[PDB]
Structures are given as C-alpha cells and as structure tokens.
C-alpha cells in the first residue's frame, strides 16, 4: 500500500497564500491535489507525473496555484497564491500508478481544511 499525508492547512485572509505539502510513502507514477467544498463534488485542483514534465490544473486556479514535486523526498506541494473565499474546502492529496488521465485514484490522504475569509 501507499500512504499519504497532507500538511499546511488552515485559515487565511483573502488575497493571502498557503503552501500545502503531501508526503507520499513510496514512489508512485502520478500525484494530485483535490478539493471538496461543502456539499460538493470533490474536484481536481492540480495533477503531476512523477517522471514527465506533465501538470494539469483546474481552470479556476490556473495561474494562481502551482503544483510541484520534490522527488528525493517523495513530496508534492501545492503553492496557493491570491486566495479567494471560493477556495475554501477540504484539500486532499492522492497518488497511484494508474494512467495519468484516469478518473479514479487508488490511494488518498486524510484531507486538511483550508478556509479563506474576507475579514
């Protein structure tokens, strides 16, 4: 099995930044970040291959968030800039060695809450 562990969640002022990280227990072919707003379908945020140069982003975070990886540490990061209230959600990482475009991901982290507020 593969285990995953997210870190770096919390609450921040709108317009601020966060950086989520995800420890993956062993080498996998792909890794991704997902988010699930209240009552809503879980959605792709950003995905990455371990070896290629491939990344893909959800439209609404394109150009604000960046996915990156540290291969030596088996860690995947989600740098989140210019945060908006609509970025509020539980953020999860996932990984496996299924083909890059596959809709189902075999191994999931625990999630962490992200709350963005204007106040």
Q: Which long-range contacts (CB under 8 A, 24 or more apart) does 50-56 make?
A: 52/100, 54/100
By CB under 5 A, residue 59 contacts Mg ion: yes
Contact 43, 58 (CB under 8 A): yes
> Can you name the residues that pair with 93 across neighbouring β-strands?
33
When binding is defined by CB under 5 A, the residue of 6, 22, 30, 96 that contacts Cl ion is: 96
Which C-beta is closer to Cl ion: that of 73 or that of 106?
106
Q: How far apart are CA 66 and CA 72, in angstroms?
A: 19
Shortest distance (Å) from residue 44 CB to Mg ion: 8
Only one of the segments 32-40, 48-56, 65-73, 92-100 lies at the binding site for Cl ion (rule: CB under 5 A); that segment is 92-100
Shortest distance (Å) from residue 25 CB to Mg ion: 29
Which C-beta is closer to Mg ion: that of 38 or that of 59?
59
Which C-beta is closer to Mg ion: that of 37 or that of 58?
58
> Can you name the residues that pair with 36 across neighbouring β-strands?
90
* 3-state helix, strand and coil shares in percent for the chain, rounded to the nearest 5: 10, 50, 40
By CB under 5 A, residue 103 contacts Mg ion: no
Site residues for Mg ion per CB under 5 A: 58-59
């Amino acid at each position: 099995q593969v285990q995953l562990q997210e870190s770096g969640g919390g609450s921040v002022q709108a317009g601020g930044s966060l950086r989520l990280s995800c420890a993956v227990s062993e080498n996998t072919g792909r890794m991704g970040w997902f988010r699930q707003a209240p009552g809503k379908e879980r959605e792709k945020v950003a995905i990455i291959t371990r070896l290629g140069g491939y990344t893909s982003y959800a439209g609404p975070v394109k150009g604000r968030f960046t996915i990156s990886q540290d291969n030596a540490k088996n860690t995947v990061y989600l740098l989140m800039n210019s945060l908006k209230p609509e970025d509020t959600a539980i953020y999860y990482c996932a990984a496996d060695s299924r083909p890059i475009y596959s809709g189902t991901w075999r191994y999931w982290g625990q999630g962490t809450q992200v709350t963005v507020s204007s106040a």
